[PDB]
Amino acid sequence: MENFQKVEKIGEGTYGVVYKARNKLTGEVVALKKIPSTAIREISLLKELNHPNIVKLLDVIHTENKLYLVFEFLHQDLKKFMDASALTGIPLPLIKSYLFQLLQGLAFCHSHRVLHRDLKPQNLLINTEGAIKLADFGLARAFGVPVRTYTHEVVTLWYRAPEILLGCKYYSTAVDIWSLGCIFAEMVTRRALFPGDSEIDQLFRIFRTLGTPDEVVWPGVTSMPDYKPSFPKWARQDFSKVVPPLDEDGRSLLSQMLHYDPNKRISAKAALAHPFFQDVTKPVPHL
């Protein structure tokens, strides 16, 4: 760590503090995250998982029984950008560019059998060139997703897939598509899709919009560990009411990203081929 000078505190992550820092060896400006042998091996494997839409993991330092992750630095996150774009909205071509890029990052990681499991606007980072990148890929498998962060802050449930909430033990890559669909809807409408404040509130918010799932739409759902037959039965809403003014192609794609049955939910690779991306471009964001 003597090789790094802290510039400022960027924020408080799930596992530890995040600093902007300078690498004295190379002059490099980096993001430095302060965080068992299985974790070291898992996280070390992530150094090779390189893609332009994945925040680059520069190094893993294990010392004095502390773990430091050194990442590529980006100047803004999507949560802050969404807040700053509240009054006007992020323009649709930029939303489309971001979604397209995020799907490319997911398709790459998924092809290597690596899941994120905790995607949220705060771990999507943006630059002034129009790129967006996924941060903290692979960390949930290494460390778990806790209920509270290291500062006691509540870890958000808003982007969590229903199979996780219903107690499935085995996650598929579909969990990340669900999260990204929730983010897409939030960029379009300027409000979170499913802002739950407990596990049951999260689940019932999903049910009230998409309908309470049953064996017709999701074979096996009624046998899931946390499923209860006493869940209320709500009707599904039309996406035309959920995400106006999104066009028919965008609503089609979103619907497929939010299918209940993870085996039905669209893959990142299939989503990239969707007609919504026919006119995709890479605008320069305002910032």
Catalytic positions are 118
Segment interacting with Na ion (CB under 5 A) among 68-76, 148-156, 176-184, 218-226: 68-76
Selection from Na ion, ligand 1CK, none that 80 binds (CB < 5 to 8 A by kind) is ligand 1CK
Q: Answer with the entry of Na ion, ligand 1CK, none that 137 interacts with (C-beta below 5 to 8 A by kind).
A: none
Q: Which listed option, ligand 1CK, Na ion, none, makes contact with residue 270 (CB within 5 to 8 Å by class)?
A: none
Tokens of 64: 């004095």
Interface positions with ligand 1CK (CB under 6 A): 10, 31, 55, 71-77, 80, 125, 135
Cα separations in angstroms, 200 against 6, 158, 186, 204, 244: 41, 12, 21, 6, 27
- Tally the residues of the chain: 287
Binding residues: 10-18, 33, 72-74, 77, 120-123, 136
Site for Na ion in 108-167 (CB under 5 A): 121
Binding-site annotation: residue ranges for Mg(2+): 123, 136
For position 247 contacting Na ion by CB under 5 A, the verdict is yes
Q: From the list 70, 99, 177, 206, which residue makes contact with Na ion (rule: CB under 5 A)?
A: 70
Neighbours of 74 (CB within 10 A): 18
Hey, what are 222's tokens?
A: 């009624």
Secondary structure (DSSP) of 96-141:
HHHHHHHHHHHHHHHHTT-------GGGEEE-TTS-EEE-STTHHH
Measured from the CB atom, the residue of 77 and 176 that comes closer to Na ion is 77
User: How far, in Å, CA of 26 to CA of 191, rounded?
Assistant: 42
